[PDB]
Structure formats: structure tokens, C-alpha cells
Amino acid sequence: CGETCTLGTCYTQGCTCSWPICKRNGLPV
């Protein structure tokens, strides 16, 4: 995802807020 949910949210849909980072299906893409 690259993005981070330091706040607890993600800007990229489909990506889960795995604080601090956003992961996608278990992948920091």
C-alpha cells in the first residue's frame, strides 16, 4: 500500500489499516 494509517484510517481502498502501516491481504503493498 505504501500509505500509513498513523491515525487509524487508510486512503487507499482495499487496503486494511494495519497501524502504523496499511497492508493489503497481508502485504505492505
Side-chain angles (χ1 to χ4, degrees):
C1 311
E3 58 171 18
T4 38
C5 70
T6 269
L7 328 180
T9 288
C10 290
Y11 277 32
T12 291
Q13 199 120 14
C15 270
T16 35
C17 162
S18 328
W19 197 104
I21 293 270
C22 289
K23 269 97 165 274
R24 209 195 139 177
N25 271 277
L27 309 169
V29 65

